[PDB]
Amino acid sequence: ADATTLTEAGYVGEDVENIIQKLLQKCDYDVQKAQRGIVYIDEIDKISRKSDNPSITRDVSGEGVQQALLKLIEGTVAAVPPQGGRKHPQQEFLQVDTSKILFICGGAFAGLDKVISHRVETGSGIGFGATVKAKSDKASE
């Protein structure tokens, strides 16, 4: 699957329970074997918050997706519609447990190297009394 498509519940983008729906397709819509399946989540880097956000905008593509996945990864029962359906008061739902379902979130965290480069070689001070003994080294990403 792709994390970018996922969005917080109650919005027009998408819901996080669709991930189980995709897994259900391969298992012939059998929840028993689905509980023992493995899941992969691509492009998780786009879900990260940028910086210093008050959250008044109620970010949906970002922080909202993470908050919903929390219970999913650790394991919680999820209501998955049968096929090509969206969550609604209707009873067209399938109780699926993600406790035994492995998750592999893979993403390209562009810019993380700079964060790591900072902490490793942030340095302290700029003047004569500062400690600039740390020397920035050229290393591959």
Binding site: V115, I126, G127, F128
Partner: protein
């Protein structure tokens, strides 16, 4: 114009002028003739920096040829008031007022560059008017002269009599000579 600099760090990147960037690192530049406006600005930086971390030291770079006395006392009093120790460093030169602020720094945290120069002299002033007014102003500057010598003697460690004799006329002291006199504690030749 001052060159703008950027800090490539987390929580976003921020652009500041080179002077403001160093201020974040607790570095205050004292340059040029001392006056009320520049001295007032330095006072704000000292008071400002105290709020973030009273324990961390503040650095003051002095390359001033001297100036007004009243403006200088506003800086001296601020340095002694705040809890963080103010480390003074002499770049290029430190005249009468700059030297008084240089020696006023925290004991053991006063430095001077190897080729820097220092000079100390008595206060200079003048008044035009009636004889009665002259006596008032003449008494005032003499009190200032005595007060400044007392403070310089305290920081340097020399006796009040020695300071009076040396400050009667301009006395130029090199970086090593200043260490012996007591104006500064050590010299910064190369980074270790």
């Amino acid at each position: 114009l001052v060159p703008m600099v950027i800090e490539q760090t987390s929580r976003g990147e921020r652009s500041f002028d080179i002077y403001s960037r160093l201020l974040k690192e607790r570095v205050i530049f004292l340059t040029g003739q001392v006056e009320d406006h520049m001295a007032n600005l330095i006072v704000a930086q000292m008071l400002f920096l105290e709020a973030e971390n009273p324990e961390k030291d503040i650095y003051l770079y002095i390359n001033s040829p001297g100036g007004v006395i009243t403006a200088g006392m506003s800086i001296y009093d601020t340095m002694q008031f705040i809890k963080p120790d103010v480390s003074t460093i002499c770049m290029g030169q430190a005249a009468s007022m700059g030297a008084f602020l240089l020696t006023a720094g925290a004991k053991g945290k006063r430095f001077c560059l190897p080729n820097s120069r220092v000079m100390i002299h008595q206060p200079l002033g003048g008044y035009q008017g009636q004889a009665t007014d002259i006596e008032i102003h003449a008494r005032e500057i003499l009190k200032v002269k005595g007060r400044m010598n007392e403070l310089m003697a305290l920081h340097t460690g020399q006796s009040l009599e020695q300071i009076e004799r040396d400050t009667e006329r301009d006395r130029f002291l090199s970086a090593p000579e200043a260490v012996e006199y007591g104006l500064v504690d050590s010299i910064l030749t190369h980074r270790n």
